Design a protein around this nucleic acid. Structure first.
Lengths: 310, 20, 23, 70, 329, 33
RNA sequence: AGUGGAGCCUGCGGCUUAAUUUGCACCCGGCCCGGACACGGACAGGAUUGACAGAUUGAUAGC
RNA sequence: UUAAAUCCUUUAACGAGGAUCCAUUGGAGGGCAAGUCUGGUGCCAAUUCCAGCUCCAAUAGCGUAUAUU
């Protein structure tokens, strides 16, 4: 309702120095650089665990033994039933490597060796980007979580020269639908192998949150001492570098393919592969040590009368 | 089907707007 | 004597509780 | 929380489907909402929108053009 | 051999029926509709109407654990792993671990060369509980997945087999069951599994006939609580064959007479929006008189929703068979 | 949706040509990236 | 002058009912029929049509 | 061609019908260009979220953030 002229309306009565900034920026820069230097010094140095690298060839045309021959300082070649994963020491470059390799399609091999790896090196062929098996492995590896990765190609120099440049051109485009801003290193010769090793040692590391909150381990050696051989159940001695966090014996130890287990002792023998060339650490107190308690520990009518008229 | 692109699409648009 | 709405008063909510982890 | 200065902000995601590409502790590239520094005329008190998660755009993720790693 | 093809075609037709008509169930012409649907109820509004989370829990919930406050407990554990300093083998140290009771087979596994890794669990991470864990669908695989078939779960360094429950990923208090894994959007899989603190990645695999594991989904562990209820929905459809002004006679939704009395208080809805109530049974054949808020069309289909809380099945198997190397079909 | 309805009723009162009010009056066409 | 009180009848509601039709329409039982197209089955070794008698049925009836 | 090449330019041979040898990026049903449209999904016919059709604009280019005019 809008009042008109006969209603009383009264109009309202209106009524740091340059040097101090420079010094402060220098202080903050010194803080950031010392934090970064400590974190980059931890991985792959003398006071830290080896740089563990997973080599995955993403095509069937890629000759993996050629590439792992190019990648191998001194080479201490640990060797298994079919796989050859070796330690590399480069004291000139002051850095320690453990190279494993795995073929795509073998799911648990690549998924375990990619959930302990610091670097993943994907091998490529010059003509096609990847295979169908490589694409499946890429989907699984992206889904699980990628660490730092580098893309290396193997057959560019084998092609005739007049196509090589534009071959690489197409290759980059073929890569860019999944790896958008990534440099395609060429791995053909020993000099390029050294360049790749240098690029792998100095590169910023992607930190995966799950494995960084948890103490994990990759077995370099394993031995079995059975209590009774016919019982097929005995003590297991697993030897490797602690990677994720400080390791406490009072905690349950989950082996990935075989469930959680109770661990009883941690010994610290000599480091078999130091960068520059029997004491038991902690035994389990049978009181604060956690137990495997997954499930709750507490266990007048006539004969013909119908139902209506009744 | 496929659409014409470039000069042909503008020709189509011109014939559609003024010719018919 | 029952229907789909009254029989809901029959069901109890105090037997199979999971064991609670406290803060 | 912004990388270069540690400042906390609140950023906008285009819809509900794009929110599942975004996870805790992931690195995200953020732009302004769009009116040169003003907030939203429909939504109170938000000024920034998410443009990339894990170095891939939300538009490529939503349209299925690219996958993101974890 | 060919019976697998028969079951495959049956699953394809059932998936197409589900994506066409969501949860429509034909009323059993033989068994009474208050016997098949005895453990069902009707909700006025699916979102706002209440439901007791502790009501009528199964025997399996007697076996699992639950967090009073999961967020604060997780914050406490993450704080005491990032801040404190426990006396143990430090990072980078080459140790040997004496672990108590391990089968011999693991050792022989190392002897062909398979990687053998281990990790240390946080507190409460061995106990079983309910994992609510969000997954989409990988577009390489288009074969159907029903709700409670076995699947292989890769969840945060752990690998196991279970029968999930597929639920809608929404913001409401209770979440509707999805009878299939729909291949366009993000769903939730509910599993009996050991506790894991998020983040963790999810990789859903389906074991194939030739030994390969086909990848069907990808995602993250969202929460650890058995208080998330999955709500199975059953849609019963009748036909309004006699139409009056704001009143109709509906048949074929029920067949016994006291079935209409049993499901009387549940409200009704039509495919063109009209709501209403059952007034009274007509008799002996399940015909009913229903009062609606408007006039009806001759092609209308009256329908009714019944809701029952479902829980997953305890098929937690910590053993996953090794694949054969995957190749494209 | 009511905001667009108010603005269209404003433009109706002001005496200019206004689009017919339909089911698609205030309707988000697509997400904006 | 009454009606509202009482008895009886009637109208809407409501209650009982298989139905107590409604703003012979209702109920309980029994008949009769009810695409082609595509593809896969059976078919002259036989597809299929007709039928007296007796019976079920509330009654009869090759429906 | 050039230091030697490459590219371009010149020239043999092959090289086009769905000439599949397949143009994108944005916006439109409140105003500058551009809608009387469809199907799912909830809330009490109105109405949050999702996928499309149709149209318009510039075009091997076209959106966005920020600064600035």
């Amino acid at each position: 309702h809008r009042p008109g002229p006969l209603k009383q309306q009264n109009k309202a009565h209106k009524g740091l120095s340059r040097v101090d900034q420079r010094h402060r920026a220098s202080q903050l820069r010194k803080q950031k650089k010392e934090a970064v230097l400590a974190e980059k010094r931890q991985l792959g140095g003398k006071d830290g665990p080896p740089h563990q690298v997973l080599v995955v060839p993403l095509h069937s045309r890629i000759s993996l033994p050629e590439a792992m021959q190019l990648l191998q300082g001194t080479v201490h070649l640990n060797e298994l039933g079919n796989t050859q994963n070796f330690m590399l020491l480069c004291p000139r470059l002051k850095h320690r490597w453990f190279f494993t390799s795995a073929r795509p399609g073998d799911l648990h091999v690549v998924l375990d060796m990619a959930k302990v790896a610091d670097t993943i090196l994907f091998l490529l062929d010059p003509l096609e980007g990847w295979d169908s098996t490589g694409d499946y492995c890429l989907s699984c590896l992206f889904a699980q979580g990628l660490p730092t990765y580098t893309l290396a190609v193997q057959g560019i120099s084998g092609l005739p020269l007049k196509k090589q440049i534009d071959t690489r051109k197409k290759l980059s485009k073929a890569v860019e639908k999944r790896f958008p801003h990534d440099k395609l290193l060429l791995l053909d010769t020993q000099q390029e192998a050294g360049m790749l090793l240098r690029q792998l040692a100095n590169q910023k590391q992607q930190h995966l949150a799950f494995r960084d909150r948890r103490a994990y381990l990759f077995a370099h050696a394993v031995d079995f001492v059975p209590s009774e051989e016919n019982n097929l159940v005995g003590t297991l001695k697993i030897s490797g570098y602690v990677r994720g966090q400080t390791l406490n014996v009072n905690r349950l130890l989950h082996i990935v393919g075989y469930g959680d287990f109770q661990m009883k002792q941690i010994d610290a023998p000599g480091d078999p592969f130091p960068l520059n060339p029997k004491v038991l650490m902690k035994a389990d107190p049978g009181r604060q040590e956690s137990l495997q308690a997954e499930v709750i520990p507490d266990p007048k009518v006539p004969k013909g009368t119908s139902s209506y008229q009744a | 089907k496929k659409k014409k692109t470039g000069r042909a699409k503008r020709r189509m648009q011109y014939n559609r707007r003024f010719v018919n | 004597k029952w229907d789909c709405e009254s029989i809901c008063s029959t069901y109890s909510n105090l037997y199979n509780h999971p064991q609670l982890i406290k803060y | 929380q912004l990388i270069k200065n540690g400042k906390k902000i609140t950023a906008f995601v285009p819809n509900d489907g794009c929110l599942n590409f975004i996870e805790e502790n992931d690195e995200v590239l953020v732009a302004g909402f769009g009116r040169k520094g003003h907030a939203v005329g429909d939504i109170p008190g938000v000024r920034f929108k998410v443009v990339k998660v894990a170095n891939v755009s939300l538009l490529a993720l939503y349209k299925g053009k690219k996958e993101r790693p974890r | 051999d060919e019976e697998a093809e028969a079951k495959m075609l049956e699953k394809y037709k059932q998936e197409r029926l589900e994506e066409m008509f969501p949860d429509e169930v034909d009323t059993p012409r033989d068994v009474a509709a208050r016997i098949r649907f005895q453990k069902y109820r009707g909700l006025k509004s699916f979102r706002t109407s209440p439901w007791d989370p502790k009501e009528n829990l199964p025997q399996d919930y007697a076996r699992i654990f639950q967090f009073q406050n999961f967020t604060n407990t997780r914050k406490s554990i993450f704080k005491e792993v990032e801040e404190k300093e426990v006396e143990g083998a430090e990072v980078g140290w080459y140790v040997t671990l004496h672990v108590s009771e391990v089968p011999v087979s693991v050792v022989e596994c190392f002897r062909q060369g398979t990687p053998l890794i281990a990790f240390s669990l946080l507190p409460h991470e061995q106990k079983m509980s309910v994992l609510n864990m969000v997954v989409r669908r990988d577009p390489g695989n288009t074969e159907p997945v029903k709700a409670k078939e076995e699947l292989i779960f890769h969840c945060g360094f752990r690998r196991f087999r279970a029968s999930p429950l597929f639920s809608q990923h929404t913001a409401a208090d209770k979440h509707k069951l999805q009878r299939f894994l729909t291949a366009d959007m993000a769903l939730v899989a509910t599993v009996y599994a050991p506790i894991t603190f998020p983040p963790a990645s999810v990789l859903l695999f389906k074991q194939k006939s030739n030994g390969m594991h086909s990848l069907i989904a990808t995602g993250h562990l969202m929460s650890v609580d058995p208080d998330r209820m999955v709500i199975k929905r059953v849609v019963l459809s009748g036909h309004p064959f006699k139409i009056f002004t704001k009143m109709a006679v509906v048949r074929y939704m029920f067949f016994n007479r006291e079935d209409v009395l049993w499901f009387k208080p549940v409200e009704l809805r039509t495919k063109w929006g009209r709501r209403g109530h059952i007034k009274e049974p007509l008799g002996t054949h399940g015909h009913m008189k229903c009062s609606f808020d408007g006039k009806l069309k001759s092609q209308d289909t009256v329908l009714m929703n019944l809701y029952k809380r479902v829980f997953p099945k305890w098929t937690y198997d910590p053993y996953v068979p090794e694949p054969v190397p995957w190749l494209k079909s | 949706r009511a905001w667009v309805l108010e603005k269209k009723e404003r433009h109706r009162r002001q005496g200019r040509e206004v689009r017919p009010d339909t089911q698609y009056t205030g309707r988000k066409r697509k997400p904006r990236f």
